[PDB]
Design a protein around this ligand. Structure first.
Ligand SMILES: CC(C)(c1ccc(O)cc1)c1ccc(O)c(F)c1
Ligand SMILES: CC(C)(c1ccc(O)cc1)c1ccc(O)c(F)c1
Lengths: 227, 227
C-alpha cells in the first residue's frame, strides 16, 4: 500500500536537470540550434548510461546486451525526457530550462514536423496527467522493450521487461484504483513514442551525412547503430 | 468464464483468406512482386474497411473519424495480418496462400530489410504463442490506437480504445491465468508493429513517387494520407 519499490527507486535515480547552454557568441541559425540540440543530447546520453545501471537487473546483462538496449532505445528516452519537461507548457518544448523551442524556432531549425509530433506526445500525456512516477517507469520500459534485433540473452531481457511492466501494473493498481486500465493506457502511449523516435533518428542521421552540424562521439555512435 | 464477447465477435467477423494471384503471364521481377503486393493490399483494404464496421462503437464515429483511424492504422493492420499468417512458417512471410515470400524473393523485390523487420514481429509472436483471439483484438486495438492527429471526437476514440483494451484484459484474465501480465505483454508488441509500419509506409510512398509500380485508388489514397 505505501507504494511500488521499483518506482520509488527509479524516482530517486532520476538524473538532475541539465542546461543546453547555446553559445551566446554564435548568431542564431538552424546550424546553431541543431548543434546545440545534438550537443545537449550527447551530454544527456552520458547521464542516461549512468542512470540505466540503476534499473534492477540491467547491469547484470552482458555489456553487449546493455549497449544493444541503449542503442535501440536512446532516442525514445531522450524524447520522453523533453515530453515530460514540457507538460506544464503550451505548444513549447523544454529541451532544457534555458532552451525552450516554440513553433517559430522549430521552423527555423527544420524541426517543425518532428517537434509537432513530440507535441502530440505531450498533449496525450497532459490529458492522461502523466506523473513523474509513470514517466520514469515508462523510460525504463522503453529501454527494456526497445526491440534490438541483437540481443544475446533474449530471456533475461524479457525478464527485465517483466520486472518493469510489473512495477507499472502494481503502481497503477495501488495509486490509480479509479482506473483499472491505467497501466495499459500508459503502455499504449509507447507506439507513438516509437513512431516519433524512428522519424527523429532518420532526421538526424540525414543531418549527420549532410555534415553541416558537428556532432560528438557518443551521439554519433548511437546515431550510427542499426539505422 | 466461457469468454470475452468482443473477442468472440471479432473472431467471427474475421474476413476470409484472399489470394494474391500474381499474373502467371508476367515474368518475375521486382516490379511484378511489388505490383502483386500493392494489388493484394488494395483488395485487403476493401475487406479491412468492411471489417471495421464490426468493431463495437466504430461505425458510430463520424465518417471523418472512421476514415482518420483507418488512414492511420491501415498499414499496421496489413502487417499484423501477414505476421499472423506466417506464425507456422520459418523465415517466410505468407502474404497469401499463393504468395509466400522467402529471403531470396525479398531481396529481388527490394524488400529484404522490411520483410526482415516483419519477420522479427513473427519471431516475437511465435515465442508468445499468439492466438487468433489475440491477433484479432490487437488488429482492433491498432486501429483505435492509431494516433491520427485528425480526430474530431477525441473522447469517443479514447472510449473505443478503452472498450478494446478491456476486451484484451478480460480475455487474458480468463484464459491466461498463468500469466497475469500477458495483456500488457501483448500491448508491448505494438511499438515494433508501429515502427515497422512507419518504415513500410515510407518505403511504399517512395515506390509511388518513383512511379514504376502501378497502384490502385484505395491503396494510393491510404498511401497519400498524412506522410
Ligand atoms: C535527439 C534530439 C537532438 C534531442 C532530444 C531530446 C533531448 O532531451 C535532447 C536532444 C532531438 C530529437 C527530435 C527533435 O525534434 C529535436 F528537436 C531534438
Ligand atoms: C503493404 C504491403 C504491400 C502489404 C502488407 C500486407 C499485406 O497483407 C499485403 C500487402 C507490404 C508492406 C511491407 C512489406 O515488407 C511488404 F512486403 C508488403
Amino acid at each position: 500500500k505505501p507504494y511500488n519499490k521499483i518506482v520509488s527507486h527509479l524516482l530517486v535515480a532520476e538524473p538532475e536537470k541539465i542546461y543546453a547552454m547555446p553559445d551566446p557568441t554564435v548568431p542564431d541559425s538552424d546550424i546553431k540550434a541543431l548543434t546545440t540540440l545534438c550537443d545537449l543530447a550527447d551530454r544527456e546520453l552520458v547521464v542516461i548510461i549512468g542512470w540505466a545501471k540503476h534499473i534492477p537487473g540491467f547491469s547484470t546483462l552482458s555489456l553487449a546486451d546493455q549497449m544493444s538496449l541503449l542503442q535501440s532505445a536512446w532516442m525514445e528516452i531522450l524524447i520522453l525526457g523533453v515530453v515530460y519537461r514540457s507538460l506544464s507548457f503550451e505548444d513549447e518544448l523544454v529541451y532544457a530550462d534555458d532552451y525552450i523551442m516554440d513553433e517559430d524556432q522549430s521552423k527555423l531549425a527544420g524541426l517543425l514536423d518532428l517537434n509537432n509530433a513530440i507535441l502530440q506526445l505531450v498533449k496525450k500525456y497532459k490529458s492522461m496527467k502523466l506523473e513523474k512516477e509513470e514517466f520514469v517507469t515508462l523510460k525504463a520500459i522503453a529501454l527494456a522493450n526497445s526491440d534490438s534485433m541483437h540481443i544475446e540473452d533474449v530471456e533475461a531481457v524479457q525478464k527485465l521487461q517483466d520486472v518493469l511492466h510489473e512495477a507499472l501494473q502494481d503502481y497503477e493498481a495501488g495509486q490509480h484504483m479509479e482506473d483499472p486500465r491505467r497501466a495499459g493506457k500508459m503502455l499504449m502511449t509507447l507506439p507513438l513514442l516509437r513512431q516519433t523516435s524512428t522519424k527523429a533518428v532518420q532526421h538526424f542521421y540525414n543531418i549527420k551525412l549532410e555534415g553541416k552540424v558537428p556532432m560528438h562521439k557518443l551521439f554519433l555512435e548511437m546515431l550510427e547503430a542499426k539505422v
